Amino acid sequence: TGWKDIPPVPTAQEFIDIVLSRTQRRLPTQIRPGFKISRIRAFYTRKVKFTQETCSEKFGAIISSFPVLSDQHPFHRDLMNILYDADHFKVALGQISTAKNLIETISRDYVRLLKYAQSLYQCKQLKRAALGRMATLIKRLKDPLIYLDQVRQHLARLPDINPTTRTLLVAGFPNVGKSSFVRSVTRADTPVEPYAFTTKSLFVGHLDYKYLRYQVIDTPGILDHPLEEMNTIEMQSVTALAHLRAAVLYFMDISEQCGFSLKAQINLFKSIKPLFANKMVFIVLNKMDIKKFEELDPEMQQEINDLTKSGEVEILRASCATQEGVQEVKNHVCERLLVERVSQKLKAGTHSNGNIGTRLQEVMARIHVATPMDGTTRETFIPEAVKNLKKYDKNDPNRRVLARDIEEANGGAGVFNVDLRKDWILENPEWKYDKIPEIF
Amino acid sequence: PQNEYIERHRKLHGRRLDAEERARKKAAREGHKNSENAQNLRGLRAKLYAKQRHAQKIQMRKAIKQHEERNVKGTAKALSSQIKNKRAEKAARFSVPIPKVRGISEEEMFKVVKTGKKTHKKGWKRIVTKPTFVGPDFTRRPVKYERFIRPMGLRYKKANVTHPTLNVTVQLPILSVKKNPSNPLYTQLGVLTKGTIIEVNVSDLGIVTASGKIAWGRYAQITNNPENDGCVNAVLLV
Amino acid sequence: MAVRAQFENSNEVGVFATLTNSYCLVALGASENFYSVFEAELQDVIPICRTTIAGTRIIGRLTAGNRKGLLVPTTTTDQELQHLRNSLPDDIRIQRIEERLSALGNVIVCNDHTALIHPDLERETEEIIADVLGVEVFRQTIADHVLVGSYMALSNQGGLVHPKTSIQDQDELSSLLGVPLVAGSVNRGSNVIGGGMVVNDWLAVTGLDTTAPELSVIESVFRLGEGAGPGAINTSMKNTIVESFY
Amino acid sequence: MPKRAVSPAPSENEVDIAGSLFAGKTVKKGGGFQAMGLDANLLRAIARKGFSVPTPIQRKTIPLILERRDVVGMARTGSGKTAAFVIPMIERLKAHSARFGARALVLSPSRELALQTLKVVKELGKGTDLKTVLLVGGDSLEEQFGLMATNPDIIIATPGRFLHLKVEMSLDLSSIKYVVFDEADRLFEMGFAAQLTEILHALPPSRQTLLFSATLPSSLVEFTRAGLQDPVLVRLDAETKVSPDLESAFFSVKSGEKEGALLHILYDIIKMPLGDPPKPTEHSTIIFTATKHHVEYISNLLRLAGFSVSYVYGSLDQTARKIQVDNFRRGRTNILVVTDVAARGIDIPVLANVINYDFPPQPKIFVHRVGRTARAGQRGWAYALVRESDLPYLLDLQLFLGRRLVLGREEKDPSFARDIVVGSLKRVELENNVEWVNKVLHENEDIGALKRVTAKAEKLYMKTRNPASSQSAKRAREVIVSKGWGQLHAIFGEEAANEEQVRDNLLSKITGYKPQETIFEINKAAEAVRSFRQRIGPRKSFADPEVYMSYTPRVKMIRGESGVKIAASFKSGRFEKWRQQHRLGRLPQVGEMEKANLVRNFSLPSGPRFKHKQMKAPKEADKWRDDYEVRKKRVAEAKEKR
Amino acid sequence: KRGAPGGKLKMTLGLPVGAIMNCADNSGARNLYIIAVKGAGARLNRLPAGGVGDMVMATVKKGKPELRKKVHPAVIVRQAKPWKRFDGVFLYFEDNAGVIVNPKGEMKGSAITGPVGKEAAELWPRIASNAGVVM
RNA sequence: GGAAGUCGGAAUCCGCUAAGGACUGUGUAACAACUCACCUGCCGAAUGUACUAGCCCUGAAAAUGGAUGGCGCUCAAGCGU
RNA sequence: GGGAAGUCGGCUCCGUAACUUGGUACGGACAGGGGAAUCUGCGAGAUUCCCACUGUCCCUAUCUACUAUCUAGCGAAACCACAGCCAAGGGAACGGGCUUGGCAAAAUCAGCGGGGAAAGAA
RNA sequence: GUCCCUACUGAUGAACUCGUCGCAAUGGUAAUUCAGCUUAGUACGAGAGGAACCGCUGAUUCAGAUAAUUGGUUUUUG
Numbered sequence A: 001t002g003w004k005d006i007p008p009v010p011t012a013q014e015f016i017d018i019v020l021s022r023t024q025r026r027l028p029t030q031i032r033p034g035f036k037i038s039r040i041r042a043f044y045t046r047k048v049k050f051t052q053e054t055c056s057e058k059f060g061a062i063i064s065s066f067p068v069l070s071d072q073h074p075f076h077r078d079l080m081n082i083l084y085d086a087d088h089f090k091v092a093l094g095q096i097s098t099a100k101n102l103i104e105t106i107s108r109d110y111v112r113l114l115k116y117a118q119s120l121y122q123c124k125q126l127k128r129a130a131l132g133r134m135a136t137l138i139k140r141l142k143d144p145l146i147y148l149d150q151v152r153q154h155l156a157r158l159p160d161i162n163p164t165t166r167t168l169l170v171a172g173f174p175n176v177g178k179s180s181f182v183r184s185v186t187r188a189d190t191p192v193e194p195y196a197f198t199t200k201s202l203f204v205g206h207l208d209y210k211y212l213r214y215q216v217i218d219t220p221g222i223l224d225h226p227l228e229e230m231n232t233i234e235m236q237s238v239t240a241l242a243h244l245r246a247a248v249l250y251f252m253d254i255s256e257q258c259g260f261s262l263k264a265q266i267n268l269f270k271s272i273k274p275l276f277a278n279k280m281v282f283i284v285l286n287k288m289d290i291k292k293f294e295e296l297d298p299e300m301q302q303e304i305n306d307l308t309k310s311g312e313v314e315i316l317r318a319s320c321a322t323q324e325g326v327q328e329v330k331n332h333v334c335e336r337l338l339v340e341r342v343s344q345k346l347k348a349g350t351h352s353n354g355n356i357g358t359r360l361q362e363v364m365a366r367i368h369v370a371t372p373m374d375g376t377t378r379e380t381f382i383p384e385a386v387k388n389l390k391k392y393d394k395n396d397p398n399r400r401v402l403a404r405d406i407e408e409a410n411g412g413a414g415v416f417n418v419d420l421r422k423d424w425i426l427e428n429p430e431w432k433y434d435k436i437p438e439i440f
Numbered sequence B: 001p002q003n004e005y006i007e008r009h010r011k012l013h014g015r016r017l018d019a020e021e022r023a024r025k026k027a028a029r030e031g032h033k034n035s036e037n038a039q040n041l042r043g044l045r046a047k048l049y050a051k052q053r054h055a056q057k058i059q060m061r062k063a064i065k066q067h068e069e070r071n072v073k074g075t076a077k078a079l080s081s082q083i084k085n086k087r088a089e090k091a092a093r094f095s096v097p098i099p100k101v102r103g104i105s106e107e108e109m110f111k112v113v114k115t116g117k118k119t120h121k122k123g124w125k126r127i128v129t130k131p132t133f134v135g136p137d138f139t140r141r142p143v144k145y146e147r148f149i150r151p152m153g154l155r156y157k158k159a160n161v162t163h164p165t166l167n168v169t170v171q172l173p174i175l176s177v178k179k180n181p182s183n184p185l186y187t188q189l190g191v192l193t194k195g196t197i198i199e200v201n202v203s204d205l206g207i208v209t210a211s212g213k214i215a216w217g218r219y220a221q222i223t224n225n226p227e228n229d230g231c232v233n234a235v236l237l238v
Numbered sequence C: 001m002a003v004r005a006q007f008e009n010s011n012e013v014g015v016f017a018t019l020t021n022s023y024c025l026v027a028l029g030a031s032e033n034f035y036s037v038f039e040a041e042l043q044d045v046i047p048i049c050r051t052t053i054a055g056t057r058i059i060g061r062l063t064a065g066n067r068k069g070l071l072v073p074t075t076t077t078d079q080e081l082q083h084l085r086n087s088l089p090d091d092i093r094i095q096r097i098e099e100r101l102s103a104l105g106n107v108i109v110c111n112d113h114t115a116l117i118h119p120d121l122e123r124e125t126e127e128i129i130a131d132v133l134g135v136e137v138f139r140q141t142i143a144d145h146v147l148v149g150s151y152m153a154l155s156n157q158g159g160l161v162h163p164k165t166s167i168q169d170q171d172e173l174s175s176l177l178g179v180p181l182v183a184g185s186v187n188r189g190s191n192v193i194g195g196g197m198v199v200n201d202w203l204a205v206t207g208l209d210t211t212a213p214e215l216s217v218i219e220s221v222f223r224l225g226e227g228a229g230p231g232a233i234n235t236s237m238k239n240t241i242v243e244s245f246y
Numbered sequence D: 001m002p003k004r005a006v007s008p009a010p011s012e013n014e015v016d017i018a019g020s021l022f023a024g025k026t027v028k029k030g031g032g033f034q035a036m037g038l039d040a041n042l043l044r045a046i047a048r049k050g051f052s053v054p055t056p057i058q059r060k061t062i063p064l065i066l067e068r069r070d071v072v073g074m075a076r077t078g079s080g081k082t083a084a085f086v087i088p089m090i091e092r093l094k095a096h097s098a099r100f101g102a103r104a105l106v107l108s109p110s111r112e113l114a115l116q117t118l119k120v121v122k123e124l125g126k127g128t129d130l131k132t133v134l135l136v137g138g139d140s141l142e143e144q145f146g147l148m149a150t151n152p153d154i155i156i157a158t159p160g161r162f163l164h165l166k167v168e169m170s171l172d173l174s175s176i177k178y179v180v181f182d183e184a185d186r187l188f189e190m191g192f193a194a195q196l197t198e199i200l201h202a203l204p205p206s207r208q209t210l211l212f213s214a215t216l217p218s219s220l221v222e223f224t225r226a227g228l229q230d231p232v233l234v235r236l237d238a239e240t241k242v243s244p245d246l247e248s249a250f251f252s253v254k255s256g257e258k259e260g261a262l263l264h265i266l267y268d269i270i271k272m273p274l275g276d277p278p279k280p281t282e283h284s285t286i287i288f289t290a291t292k293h294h295v296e297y298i299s300n301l302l303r304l305a306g307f308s309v310s311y312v313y314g315s316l317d318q319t320a321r322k323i324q325v326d327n328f329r330r331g332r333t334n335i336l337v338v339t340d341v342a343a344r345g346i347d348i349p350v351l352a353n354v355i356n357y358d359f360p361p362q363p364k365i366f367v368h369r370v371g372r373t374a375r376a377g378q379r380g381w382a383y384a385l386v387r388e389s390d391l392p393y394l395l396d397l398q399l400f401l402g403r404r405l406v407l408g409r410e411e412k413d414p415s416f417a418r419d420i421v422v423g424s425l426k427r428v429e430l431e432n433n434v435e436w437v438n439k440v441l442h443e444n445e446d447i448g449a450l451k452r453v454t455a456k457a458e459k460l461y462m463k464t465r466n467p468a469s470s471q472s473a474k475r476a477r478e479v480i481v482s483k484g485w486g487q488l489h490a491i492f493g494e495e496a497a498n499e500e501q502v503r504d505n506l507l508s509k510i511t512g513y514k515p516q517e518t519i520f521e522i523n524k525a526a527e528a529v530r531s532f533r534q535r536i537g538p539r540k541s542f543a544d545p546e547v548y549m550s551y552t553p554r555v556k557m558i559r560g561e562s563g564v565k566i567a568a569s570f571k572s573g574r575f576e577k578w579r580q581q582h583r584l585g586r587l588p589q590v591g592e593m594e595k596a597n598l599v600r601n602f603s604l605p606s607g608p609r610f611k612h613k614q615m616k617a618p619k620e621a622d623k624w625r626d627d628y629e630v631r632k633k634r635v636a637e638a639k640e641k642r
Numbered sequence E: 001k002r003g004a005p006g007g008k009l010k011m012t013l014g015l016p017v018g019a020i021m022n023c024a025d026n027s028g029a030r031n032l033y034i035i036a037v038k039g040a041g042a043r044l045n046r047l048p049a050g051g052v053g054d055m056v057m058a059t060v061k062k063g064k065p066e067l068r069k070k071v072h073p074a075v076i077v078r079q080a081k082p083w084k085r086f087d088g089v090f091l092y093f094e095d096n097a098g099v100i101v102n103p104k105g106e107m108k109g110s111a112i113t114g115p116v117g118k119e120a121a122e123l124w125p126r127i128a129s130n131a132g133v134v135m
Numbered sequence F: 001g002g003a004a005g006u007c008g009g010a011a012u013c014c015g016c017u018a019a020g021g022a023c024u025g026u027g028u029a030a031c032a033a034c035u036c037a038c039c040u041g042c043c044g045a046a047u048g049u050a051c052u053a054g055c056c057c058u059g060a061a062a063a064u065g066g067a068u069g070g071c072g073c074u075c076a077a078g079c080g081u
Numbered sequence G: 001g002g003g004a005a006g007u008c009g010g011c012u013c014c015g016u017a018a019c020u021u022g023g024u025a026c027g028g029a030c031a032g033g034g035g036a037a038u039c040u041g042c043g044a045g046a047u048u049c050c051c052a053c054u055g056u057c058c059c060u061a062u063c064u065a066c067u068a069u070c071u072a073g074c075g076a077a078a079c080c081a082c083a084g085c086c087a088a089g090g091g092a093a094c095g096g097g098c099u100u101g102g103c104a105a106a107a108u109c110a111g112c113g114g115g116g117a118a119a120g121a122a
Numbered sequence H: 001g002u003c004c005c006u007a008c009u010g011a012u013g014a015a016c017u018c019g020u021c022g023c024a025a026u027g028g029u030a031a032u033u034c035a036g037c038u039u040a041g042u043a044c045g046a047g048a049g050g051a052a053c054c055g056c057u058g059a060u061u062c063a064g065a066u067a068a069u070u071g072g073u074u075u076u077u078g
């Protein structure tokens, strides 16, 4: 569902201040030398144990709130590795855990020392020593706290990508129209600017196609390099293109108005097809209104066609400024994804044994419509006023009055008093609002 | 929202229409606020505030002096890391299964012999309430000292030993107790008090002697109050 | 037309409403949002009566009727009965019935030609229903659920039945009635169709939690909105139903 | 309130075989009961019941008992423990004794165990005059007085009830010569340990003692060492010896994909048919889990999936337990989900598939659960799901079994029966099943609540489970570092491997990417991050085979019936009050002849014991009441009956 | 979200904490054992109690072993102790009875045996739908 | 990838000078833009940095209602001579 | 008597026929009672509910014992330096009388839950 | 091995002729938390989700009363 529920991670000074303020403010702080040595020992031992407990809770809360990278989906694990340097992330969490254990050991040692203390001064010195040691360990855990707070904030701002749903991954070089298409098909605010790398992260939008919800992932943008010197941005791009089963929309600009050569575009597509091993690939040609496909030399034209003549990569054309083919390309890709998913669900339901699954039986029952055997229908008593009516809209000047508007004018929801006799259809209209006798 | 959305909102719509003026006036009012805080708030909070202000003023004065000088103008960690890395190598890749056990404590022994002996003489148990060093675990003490009980919670085995000339502090095991300058009974019992000579294993330091050998034991003086501080601190006499 | 609405904050519109082809009954409470959505969908074509039965807001699950008649339990007071009589035209016959199963909206489903009842109703109640509603009365258990009024919603165009009803029983019910039937759910997986939806020949009101695929099933089977057609479920919406309710 | 009120009902099943540190005119060795020379009436008792061939438990224990040696027996349920110690009952007693006193005592944890013991006792003592009694809570305590006066020679009892009656009687147990603790493992699990210890103190030193169990917890081992005289410990043949006909596979899967992996292993590998099946079935799969909440969640999820599922957990209603085990033994179900202790309790048929959903803490527990199957030479499959946290336990298992451990596809044809093979599942339909699990959890609220409860239980088990060894942890770290952890498992096909090592190479190249700088570097926070990254930056056969010394081998409080803590010796005097009602004389002292008058007064009913016994007179008839005359007649008849 | 009903008027409470009642639905449970009530106010030495329409937590004392496994929520339907309805009518039922419901307010069973409390039917729409007699 | 003084490492010079840092902050994706350092004009006479000494505020307090003895006292009815 | 708490509680034999004295097949019987109710016309009458154990707790019931305001009459004893309102202060863990303050109005009745009692120290 | 004064809480009261109607120094002092409806599926949000001010209606605890009704109680010994 997200990672916005991770509690804020304090700095070292804030951590020390919180722990010490709690240990002084939630406990009594007046012991006298004239009290029993056992009572003095109990007082100081209680102070040492409280400080440690507050610490272990806040350390355990930190350790348990942050996601564990192993148990996440491969996409999430790889994206977190790209974004936060997973190894150093784990090192920081391990330091938090080791500090927790060391503070626990300090508490046990000083509790035994307070057990065998003999004076109020000695007990005071032992308590001060234990508290100062804990503060020293936190002051050591200064920097990991800063790093973890930054990771927590970034994680709370990260988008929600469900790895296994109906997904449309729009990818390609910068300056091609990826974000333009994303805002055309979804209401996600993806920055659109004339420069090169305006999209510095993965963006998520959503759409509805034949009563189904579809995810659309805008990738930042990939350059034509071998995969070993790619930046973290295009590494997020390739991670999304690698671990997300979906329909890939690879965008190209036939016009060189993007700033990269067509030959390099086909080269990168060939390079990242092994990424696109089975996920369904549609090549979208954009800025046709700047230069359509026909206005191109035929060696490039046959190069594109030879790209088509392999697997099931499909060519479509569109323009994200005139809004010409965006609806058609969306419709086509969503329809093909839907039919593929329905076919694979049917094959999964039809097992080798031949026994029809319970859920497939249920869906067959839900799609089956039963009709009378005789084939005769029933008479329908729909009046004529309904087809003589006008559909209600909240924006028409001379609309219908409506009881909401009447009560809002004559008070509110708890103040308007309804006349239950206003619709009484009697013989004489003046007999309304009459007190009908009940007892005589 | 899914990215730096507050930054996007800033770029698209701006700030509140008087935020710059409010921030400037608050920053200008900060001086009176600081004086009011110094003169009004009271009780451990004023103490923390005063300590913080002292630290800030010292840092600012140091920065000013260093900047004036620079505008006019036109190892112990290493030895400790070497020692720790050697220890990690040995303990990680020369550690082999060995029958590793320990004897029972003098408290357990005393409880057992007390179950054996009904009539408890009043005060027959005196507990040594000072930190001690023992060495072995299941030792039988002479009848001279058999009733001195030294608890596990008070026993110490390692000390933070500082080499002055090779300026570095390392954690080293304690080999023996040579002289407690307060009591011969304490130096017999291994009581660790302030200014107490102990024998420390200095093998990890790699100190070269005159003949060319590595020192395996030196004298170190305990220079803290281990009864008040839950640690033993020694300075090496070299 | 199919519209999504909530009574107060509840998605069960069938509990608080009773829609027929000549009148609508609306539970009375606090605001006028529920009455107002019903009125905006029925702009004085048929009367709408703000009514209470036995001092309750469950009028939808307590009353059963069609355009020819209305039946209310014996617990209904004379004042509420007189309110209903004054509010409704004389072409609709209203009666109180002395049935032990006073949950009339739970024990009776009736279109304008047939009624299907809880098997344990009394004989006298059976002739009373057949006379006032002017329908052929049959006793049947829908999906082994004995409360047909809660687990099926019916109109003269079609009828939507409990999601876990067998195909044989669905076919038998379709033959016995004369309208298409489909096994579907309302309010995002709820089985209480009658309590979660009121439907007449040209209007349906469901809860706000009704999903888009199942709202399209409702519009299709009850022929609400342009072409509709029970058959479109089997032709144009299969992919949707299979992908959504797998 | 009772959401984990006291504890998870199945806690753990600890076992320790280090309890074995306790120590032609001449028919030749026919292994017969007559060959061990039982008396004629006993032999005809066997001839009627129909146990023709002795079970190994009987063959190994009966002669030692006849030699009168203290016995500690290890067997799984259904082996024949109850007959194995009840044949010596009558074989030793041979007759009823007129002298007052009991001679045989059997202690059973629960009433149903006492009842099964009672039937084995009666249909073996058919013919003899021995008196056998049953003492459990809930029975009429006055009837228990009456039976104690009736003087049984054999007493089968629940320890708490027996303790209460002994304290109420001041019984002289010196006449008892035989003591049996039947399932002392469950005795200690239920916590009767103090009661058992003080009962053992009450019994005289001169007795012969048997203790029968499936496992040997450390507490049981200490109890036997403290209370048994030179105990001989017997095993039922080979539980430790893993069957060579067992082929095992281990699947590295994540916590968020456990359910998907289980659905995958059922659907694709085991090829499980769905629906009610048309003596086990052909598929016969058991699923061993950790917690009762895990059992609930998995059983409900599989039932939603459509599988024929039976569940047995620790604190299950006994009638439901019988129903589920009956379905499993008769083949009405194919899935049987148990944690550990329900499986220990129930008698499991021969199985074809064993699935370990939660990896065992002990290799010994693993060996037990896998020796459950692949018996009598039949082939068996054992699939186990392993996480990164369960990996050190897997390596401990590898060391225990002495098997070579292969990762992914390091070998073209690894031996599933001789090697420990670890691999990954097929990602495509694994993700399909994971999506199914996510959808069903998001749709159904009850299963979502079950998932939350079992997640909390899993956290508790992780906190309270016995950790592994340091070397196992280090080897877990190194194998996680190694490539074989993430590779596809061997059972899925070499062609599948072809596509896998075709595609995964640059997927591995993505996974093993080291960023040059984080997003925060792309302020004081940035400076701290940079400094900390800079700090963490990477750091720059000669053995005589014959005689080389190796480092490795080769007032006390007791819980009463009311549940409130009660003093161990609390004579409420209700036995005094008992003979005050019954006007009886002094009870027969141990050794005197039985009193036939006392037996006739309190011996037994005429057979079946009917629970309902409540006689009230009817209410007084009212003239205005309809049935006045008949109610008056009924009242008069009740008055005559008195 | 705590299962505290809204808008409920005062009635005399008839089922306290630690109280055995019948189960009115076909879920397989026979009796319920109220251990806790929702919306209770903790005052010293008072045992909390619930009236018709209040959500409670109960353990199935006898019935289906699947249900005899966990503490289930339940809305109590019938109350033997008399109470007053605002029409001035003091009334009571033959026994004390409730139905298993999820925290949202949806029943595990599919039918209710016996009549339903009017307050419970008004407060929980699902009970009103699965009820056959309402008084 | 982009880094133009201002995400980062190191040097940190010269001209024009009245003076202007290979830059002290705001800012841009990178610029641009503003501002500071420094300089000039108007203004006009004393300022400003650190310390020291008095008096004053803070520099820690629990728990019946109370105590410079009490009232009360402020160019004292307080402090120094 | 009722409520509550905990529980692991609720829901084969006789005769007959062959076989070696005992088993084998066949035929028949077995595997409840009590109380409280509801429904159809006492009715094979039909349907619903409750039956447990406990060295646990509480309440109701019975018995035992002490339990009592005023009036007429009769009529003690214990105990008694003198007294009796508080807060702060009164160096000796000391206040009841002293300092300086709060205050403070005859004579009584009843209730009573505070004070007018306590250490001695290794 | 050491029934009395007073505090508090209520009730009477002499003298100022009896009485009726008042004033108010001083002392005490009281309400509390939650929920539901509307706002509103609104603002906000890619999605999942999702408030608040005014207005309205109930409930917990606390406090002070009251007995029309509804239980309980019976020496009405009816």
Ligand SMILES: Nc1nc2c(ncn2[C@@H]2O[C@H](COP(=O)(O)OP(=O)(O)OP(=O)(O)O)[C@@H](O)[C@H]2O)c(=O)[nH]1
Pocket: A173, A174, A175, A176, A177, A178, A179, A180, A181, A191, A192, A193, A194, A195, A196, A197, A198, A199, A220, A221, A286, A287, A288, A290, A318, A319, A320, A321, A322
């Ligand atoms: N005329 C025209 N310009 C287009 C079209 N699509 C995109 N652009 C231009 O492309 C630039 C924006 O690119 P985006 O739409 O954000 O696409 P992107 O691939 O994310 O590219 P970057 O902005 O470089 O990250 C602007 O200059 C747009 O005007 C199109 O169909 N027609």
